[PDB]
Ligand binder design. Structure first.
Ligand SMILES: N#Cc1cccc(Cl)c1NC(=O)Cn1c2ccccc2c2ccccc21
Length: 476
């Protein structure tokens, strides 16, 4: 008699799920559980709930259900193991340090109850511990070294077979009459969110949406882009995949295999999988470093004397800096949950080494709240990279908070879109409205300093001083 539980955390999908697949074989019963207890904003929570709704719908097609349990894993699992006579628990492996800690605690609870624990890798292409072992026990802090080590790995695992009725076979899911009340997927309102002024999501969550986008994304790559940021790129794309990769609606391995297959048929260079390998790079760097998201106590982070300035930080996080390019980017972020990678560079440089001299830790927390694709490893890694705090990054140049926006969207339509208060300004002044004469401000029906703030710093001087201060941290 084998009674199994598969615990969803990431990997919110039925395709390429080796842990769920392995759990199901030889089992008599199976139940898939998600555990949630009622720094995450409404867009991230809405995405998660839509993922869980899609999972429950797809399990329903298999004569099963998703079980959503409200609580803490260490508090709910002991009695669950007992009630359901559980003998096997499966999880997709979590390389991140806090998830490792949580999973080690559950493993000991499982052992005490005589429960076998199955762990399989499917959030990353590679076994990250084997990369670290290859490198002598420390992760590589350069991309080229990472590539070299990966080229000595065994060829990659192919994705596992989707969970179907055939896979499930004679295994089944016992279902109680009270299932939809006791184990049902929560609502935003039940989590405490006012959904009064809530437009529908720019980024619908779920495996079904992810796989649809994946197909269209490949057609676009071959047919339209031919495998090769402008005003268009700043706006969300219907074939963008990154929030689905972060939540695990889309397998990174399935994506990788589909990309290689598409290229083979139609026509590979590393640029074909550039994005996916940077993902593995930061996970690898983070896995053995519990202070990866901190400056102090973080052995890979340069110690830099950042300022504490809650007023400036709040202006940055709420898009009230008086620099329209920065404010529009931070507005799209809060409203929609995604901004272009190069827009992230711009606002991150502004907050840290370029202008405000505020610690990268603070920007990382705002991004963790608002960015759908901001998993902990890549977010902390990127903020250290941008602030010149690790990965041997140097302060060569500083993004201009006027000129970069002006070069990406010369017309300023992006500004007019997210900062409609500035819609009346001509392109000559749209990125530096404080330089507009009062008469232009009067026709635009926007008095700078009254209806839209004046710039919070002088960029030419703040950047000059900042570059100086960073230079002198190092021996000249
Ligand atoms: N990929 C990659 C990569 C590779 C090398 C260097 C950097 Cl900074 C990289 N990050 C980006 O380009 C964009 N990016 C950011 C930029 C600034 C701050 C946070 C983020 C962030 C968070 C989650 C996901 C992508 C993110």
């Amino acid at each position: 008699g084998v009674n199994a539980v598969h615990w969803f955390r990431k990997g919110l999908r039925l395709h390429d799920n080796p842990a769920l697949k392995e759990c199901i074989q030889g089992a008599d019963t199976i139940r898939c559980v998600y555990i949630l207890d009622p720094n995450v904003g409404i867009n991230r929570w809405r995405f998660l709930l839509q993922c869980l709704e899609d999972l429950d719908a797809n399990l329903r097609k298999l004569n099963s259900r998703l079980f959503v349990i409200r609580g803490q894993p260490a508090d709910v699992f002991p009695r669950l193991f007992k009630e359901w006579n559980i003998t096997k628990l499966s999880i997709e492996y979590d390389s991140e340090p806090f998830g490792k800690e949580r999973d080690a605690a559950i493993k000991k609870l499982a052992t005490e109850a005589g429960v076998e624990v199955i762990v399989r890798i499917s959030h990353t292409l590679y076994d990250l511990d084997k990369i670290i072992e290859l490198n002598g026990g420390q992760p590589p802090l350069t991309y080229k070294r990472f590539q070299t080590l990966v080229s000595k790995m065994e060829p990659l695992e192919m994705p596992a077979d989707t969970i179907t009725s055939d896979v499930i076979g004679k295994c089944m899911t016992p279902l109680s009459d009270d299932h939809d009340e006791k184990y049902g997927v929560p609502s935003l309102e039940e989590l405490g969110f006012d959904t009064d002024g809530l437009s529908s999501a720019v980024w619908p969550g779920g495996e079904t949406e992810a796989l649809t986008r994946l197909e269209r994304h490949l057609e676009r790559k071959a047919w339209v882009a031919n495998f090769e940021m402008n005003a268009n790129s700043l706006l969300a794309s219907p074939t963008g995949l990154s929030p689905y990769l972060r939540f695990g609606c889309l397998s990174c391995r399935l994506f990788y295999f589909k990309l290689t297959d598409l290229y083979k048929k139609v026509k590979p260079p590393l640029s074909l999988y550039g994005q996916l390998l940077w993902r593995e790079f930061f996970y690898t760097a983070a896995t053995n470093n519990p202070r990866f998201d901190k400056m102090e106590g973080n052995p890979i982070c340069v110690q830099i004397p950042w300022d504490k300035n809650p007023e400036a930080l709040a202006k940055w996080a709420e898009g009230r800096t008086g620099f329209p390019w920065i404010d529009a980017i931070m507005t799209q972020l809060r409203q929609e949950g995604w901004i272009h990678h190069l827009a992230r560079h711009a606002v991150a440089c502004f907050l840290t080494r370029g202008d405000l001299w505020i610690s990268w830790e603070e920007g990382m927390k705002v991004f963790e709240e608002l960015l759908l694709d901001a998993d902990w490893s890549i977010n902390a890694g990127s903020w250290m990279w941008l602030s010149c705090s690790s990965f041997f990054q140097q302060f060569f140049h500083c993004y201009c908070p006027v000129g970069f926006g002006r070069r990406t969207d010369p017309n300023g339509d992006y500004i007019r879109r997210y900062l409609p208060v500035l819609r009346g300004f001509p392109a000559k002044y749209i990125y530096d409205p404080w330089n507009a004469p009062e008469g232009i401000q009067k026709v635009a029906k926007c008095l700078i300093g009254v209806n839209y703030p004046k710039p919070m710093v002088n960029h030419a001087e703040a950047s000059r001083l900042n570059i100086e201060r960073m230079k002198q941290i190092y021996q000249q």
